[PDB]
Amino acid sequence: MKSYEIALIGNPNVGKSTIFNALTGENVYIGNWPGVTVEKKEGEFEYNGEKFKVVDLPGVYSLTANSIDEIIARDYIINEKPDLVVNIVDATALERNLYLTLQLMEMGANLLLALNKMDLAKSLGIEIDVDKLEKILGVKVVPLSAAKKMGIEELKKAISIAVKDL
Ligand SMILES: Nc1nc2c(ncn2[C@@H]2O[C@H](COP(=O)(O)OP(=O)(O)O)[C@@H](O)[C@H]2O)c(=O)[nH]1
Ligand SMILES: [Mg+2]
Ligand SMILES: [Mg+2]
C-alpha cells in the first residue's frame, strides 16, 4: 500500500488533539520525544486506498527555538520531511497564527491549512474569508468544526490531494 507521512501542528488550544483523534484509527501510539517527557502521539488512517501516517507535533506559536516544543517541532519538520504538514488554525484566532504559517513556508514545508472552530466563530459573529486566505497564501484551506464531527472527511480528502503536487 502506498504510504505517506503527515504531521499536525498549530497553536495551543486549536482542537489539534480532537482532530488527531478523529483523523486516526483506534491504534494510536503514545510515546515521548527522545530525551524528554514531551508526549509524542502517532496514528494512521487509510483513505481512498492509501495509508497516511499521522504524527502529532507540540502546539506552538512559532518555530524560532523559544522553548523545547518549538525545538522538537522544527527539528522534526526539517529532518523527517513529512510529505505534508497540516497547520491547524483557530478560526476565532486567525491573526495570531500568521507567523507559524509564514515560518512553515519559509522552512519549505509542503502545507495545508485546517480552519477549525468555524462553529464557534459562527456563534461569535466572526466572519472569515477563506477564498481570500487561500489566494494570499497559495495553500488550500479546509473549514471545519472537529468537535461537531464536521468536515473531517473534507480534511482527509484535502490531505490526499495535497500530498501529490501541482
Ligand atoms: N466550538 C468548537 N470547539 C472545539 C472544536 N474542536 C475542539 N474544540 C474545543 O477546543 C478545546 C481544546 O481542544 P484540544 O483538542 O485539546 O485542542 P489542542 O489544545 O490543540 O489539543 C476542547 O475543549 C474542545 O472541546 C470545534 O470544532 N468547535
Ligand atoms: Mg478517529
Ligand atoms: Mg483515533
Curated annotation (Swiss-Prot):
Residues that bind Mg(2+) 1: N21, A22, T24
Impact noted for substituting K41A: Slight decrease in GTP hydrolysis rate
Residue sites binding Mg(2+) 2 per the record: N21, T24, G25
Binding site residues for GTP 2: G35, V36, T37, V38, E39
Positions contributing to GTP 3 binding: D56, L57, P58, G59
Annotated positions binding GTP 1: G10, N11, P12, N13, V14, G15, K16, S17
All copies of domain FeoB-type G, residue ranges: 3-165
Residues noted as binding GTP 4 in the record, renumbered to the chain: N116, K117, M118, D119
Quaternary state and interactors: The crystallized N-terminal domain is a homodimer.
Biological function: Probable transporter of a GTP-driven Fe(2+) uptake system, might be able to transport Fe(2+) into or out of the cell.
Protein name as it appears in the record: Fe(2+) transporter FeoB
Species of the source: Methanocaldococcus jannaschii (strain ATCC 43067 / DSM 2661 / JAL-1 / JCM 10045 / NBRC 100440)
Lineage per the UniProt record: Archaea, Methanobacteriati, Methanobacteriota, Methanomada group, Methanococci
Range of the intact protein held here: 1 to 165 of 668
